[PDB]
Every structure is written in C-alpha cells, then in structure tokens.
Design an enzyme around this catalytic site. Structure first.
Site, PDB file in Angstrom:
ATOM      1  N   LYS A  22     -10.368   0.259  -1.390  1.00 27.93           N
ATOM      2  CA  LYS A  22     -10.152  -0.117   0.009  1.00 27.93           C
ATOM      3  C   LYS A  22     -10.476   1.053   0.926  1.00 27.93           C
ATOM      4  O   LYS A  22      -9.861   2.127   0.836  1.00 27.93           O
ATOM      5  CB  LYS A  22      -8.709  -0.590   0.251  1.00 27.93           C
ATOM      6  CG  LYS A  22      -8.387  -0.920   1.724  1.00 27.93           C
ATOM      7  CD  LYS A  22      -6.984  -1.538   1.838  1.00 27.93           C
ATOM      8  CE  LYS A  22      -6.471  -1.520   3.272  1.00 27.93           C
ATOM      9  NZ  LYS A  22      -5.119  -2.190   3.407  1.00 27.93           N
ATOM     10  N   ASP A  55       0.868  -1.177   0.000  1.00 32.16           N
ATOM     11  CA  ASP A  55       0.000   0.000   0.000  1.00 32.16           C
ATOM     12  C   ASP A  55       0.912   1.236   0.000  1.00 32.16           C
ATOM     13  O   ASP A  55       1.511   1.548   1.021  1.00 32.16           O
ATOM     14  CB  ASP A  55      -0.883   0.046   1.272  1.00 32.16           C
ATOM     15  CG  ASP A  55      -1.984  -1.013   1.298  1.00 32.16           C
ATOM     16  OD1 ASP A  55      -1.904  -2.037   0.573  1.00 32.16           O
ATOM     17  OD2 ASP A  55      -2.934  -0.825   2.094  1.00 32.16           O
ATOM     18  N   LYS A  68      -7.063   3.390  -2.180  1.00 28.32           N
ATOM     19  CA  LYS A  68      -7.330   3.238  -0.747  1.00 28.32           C
ATOM     20  C   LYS A  68      -7.586   4.632  -0.183  1.00 28.32           C
ATOM     21  O   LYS A  68      -6.932   5.608  -0.594  1.00 28.32           O
ATOM     22  CB  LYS A  68      -6.134   2.539  -0.061  1.00 28.32           C
ATOM     23  CG  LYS A  68      -6.140   2.543   1.485  1.00 28.32           C
ATOM     24  CD  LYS A  68      -5.046   1.600   2.023  1.00 28.32           C
ATOM     25  CE  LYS A  68      -4.785   1.804   3.532  1.00 28.32           C
ATOM     26  NZ  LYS A  68      -3.607   0.987   3.993  1.00 28.32           N
TER      27      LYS A  68
END
Lengths: 217, 217
Positions: free
Chosen positions: A185, A92, A156
C-alpha cells in the site's frame, strides 16, 4: 484505468488531529460517492464511520499505535480489537521503527505478530506501516521480511506524518521483497491522478489517499 | 534557580518514532545524571525506563493516545492503566482536539474524565496536552476549563509534533485560567536555559524538554 476502478484501490483517509465530526462525515460522504475501498480514520471515529458507511460497500478501517508506532503491544492489541469490534474491517499498524533501527528483530517481530494474531482471530487483515522516510533501503527490505514473517497481510509505505511519504522506488523495493505474497500500500503525499497511477505501476495494490477528491475529479 | 532545582521542573523527554533502545537508555542516563523530575516516553518503553530508573527518584511517565489525541477513550484508558502498572507515575494524555474544535464539549469532557478517573484510581496524576498550535485562544481557555472540570492535574501546551510548541503568551493564558488549582506544563521547542526560565515566569510549574543537557549545562 477508470475513475471507478482507481477508486477501488483507495483507502480514503482523514487522520488529522483536528478533524471534526463534520470533517469525518465529509470524508465518508466522499468515499460513498466515489465508492472507494475504505475510509481510514483514527480509532475514536470508528463507531461514527461505521454508522455512516452502513449499507454500503465502503469498509471502515483504523490505524492503531499511530503514527509513532511506539505504543505497548498489548495496548495496540486492545486498540485494534476494540476498533474491529466497533466496525473496522482492516487495521493499519505502525512498525516499531526504533526496535528495527536498533536491530532488535525479535521485538519487531513480537510486536507485529501480536497484532496479526489479534486481527486474524477476528477474520480481518493487518497492514504494517514501515514509515520508509525513517529507514535505510536495507531496513525497508528487512521490515518487509519481518512483517511477512509476523503474518502481516500488507506492508504500507508511510503514516503521512513523517518527512516524506510514498516513493515509486520504495514501492518497487517493497513489492520485490514481498512478491505477490503480501499487498503493498502506497500512502502519504499522493496528490494527483498521475502520481496514483505511478504507484500502481510501481507495484502498489492499494493506496492511502487524503486528496482523493482532487484525484478522482 | 540552581541547575539542580531547575532539573526538578523537567520531564526529560524522548518521543521520536525512531528512538532506539540505546537512545532511550541515553535519555535515562541523562535524567539520572541531572536528577530531573521524570523521563517521558511512549508507552512501549515504560518497562525499560522503569528498570533503568529503578532505585532513583526520577519517575518514568508515559504519553497516551499520543500525539494525535484521536484514540478511542477506552483504548486510551487501557494504554494508561497498563503503563501505570508497568511503572509510569504520571500520564500525559492528548486532548480530543477534533471534538473540541467541533464544539462537542460533553465528549471532550467525558474523554478527559475517563482518563482522570482511571489514573486517579491508581493514585497517579494526569496531564492534558492541549496542542495549542491547533487551537483558537478561546479554545485554549475552554480546554483548560474542561480539563479542570474533568479532574485533570495539569494542562500541557504541546506534543512536540505539531506546527509549534510552548509559547509564553499561551502559558500565561493557561495559568490565568486554571489559577493555582492545576499545574501548567510548557513543552515543545524549549531549547535554551533562558527559554526555560521564561516559561517558568509565564507560569509553568513543569516543562517537557528534549534539549535537557544543553539547558542544564
């Protein structure tokens, strides 16, 4: 949605600067108990997490250039490739927010693309944390477009270290922008089962949760 | 203390995740106007800062593994030596707070030692951010001693991203611990010329400041 299948949405997360080895082991214990998708940690803890999760279905995953997203791209790549080599299955990264807000779309792109190339070369997947708290709604849309163009697998919402985290309307905006072509996400400030379900309903296909125990019990 | 000599204590700092190129340029403009010691940025902005400060006595310096200090040591080292190669004259790393809190001193030491050796091999100097906000008083002392033993050149109070920054009593404790053998940098929340002077009297030999203009005018 059962607790077991809700758990499958969850990257169980512990990123606090003062997390000890004991703290990180507990996060691993919890993830194994509930069979979450992942344990998400800072890169220093990847060897340990990988060891703890060995022989289980739970994936170690790492944040990189985190949480500020202002690390040199080549250094982010080094952190990411090292993390994958040491056991991370997903990375990430954080959007270069300053370049996006400054309208340097080409630099935002080059930054994500370098990580995407490195991560995909090792057969793994890359999420880009937009840090929605710091962005206008138009910038959230633009960040999703650039993330997709650069080859990211997920967008995300949040690092968990800014002024706010996942919002239902942001998650929906992100899912509308990437359609079914990238994962979305929802992360940051997700504290209850009701909140978790609302994020899924808003379009999240994965969640970053640190208060995972409270949510799954 | 003249305004011109006070400026020489100051690493003029801009580390916000949403800092644009123009924001960073403005920070460089300010540092050059007042002749501060440094401009301190995240590693992504080192080539730009180096260009902006070229031909002046203001030093680009970079934070690394920042602000969480939970990046793998090898990745912190690469971020640091890469930054130096791109123009950084000093590196401010962050202590591995989690390993310190866990009492794992051999890992705290090895982490600082790797950076110190790499930074010194290039002939530059290393500061260790303790993040006092997260530490017990014994931990501040131990962190200072480990930094000294590992070869660090400075101990620094704070990242600017935790719950509190530089405190006079913490600065005194740090200065008493390292004596005159290391520098002491007070950083985080320094908002007035009066506060700056206080930090110096408590024992700071350098300061991290974002409100540099206000302070110097």
């Amino acid at each position: 949605l059962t607790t077991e299948q809700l758990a499958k949405y969850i990257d169980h997360t512990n990123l606090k600067a003062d997390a000890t080895e004991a703290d990180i082991k507990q996060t691993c214990d919890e993830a194994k108990k509930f069979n979450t998708a992942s344990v998400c940690v800072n890169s220093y803890w990847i060897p340990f997490v990988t060891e703890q999760l060995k022989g289980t279905d739970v994936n170690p995953i790492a944040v990189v250039g985190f949480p500020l997203g202002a690390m040199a791209t080549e250094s982010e790549i080094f952190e990411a490739t090292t993390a994958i080599d040491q056991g991370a299955e997903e990375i990430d990264m954080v959007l270069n927010v300053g370049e996006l807000k400054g309208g340097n779309d080409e630099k935002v792109l080059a930054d994500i693309q370098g990580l995407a190339d490195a991560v995909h070369a090792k057969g793994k997947i890359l999420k880009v944390i937009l840090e929605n708290a710091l962005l206008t709604k138009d910038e959230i849309v633009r960040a999703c477009q650039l993330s997709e163009k650069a080859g990211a697998d997920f967008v995300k919402t949040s690092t968990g270290f800014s002024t706010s985290g996942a919002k239902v309307e942001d998650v929906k905006l992100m899912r509308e922008t990437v359609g079914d072509r990238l994962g979305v996400k929802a992360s940051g400030g997700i504290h209850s089962r009701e909140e978790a379900l609302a994020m899924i309903d808003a379009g999240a296909s994965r969640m970053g949760v640190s208060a995972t125990v409270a949510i799954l019990t």
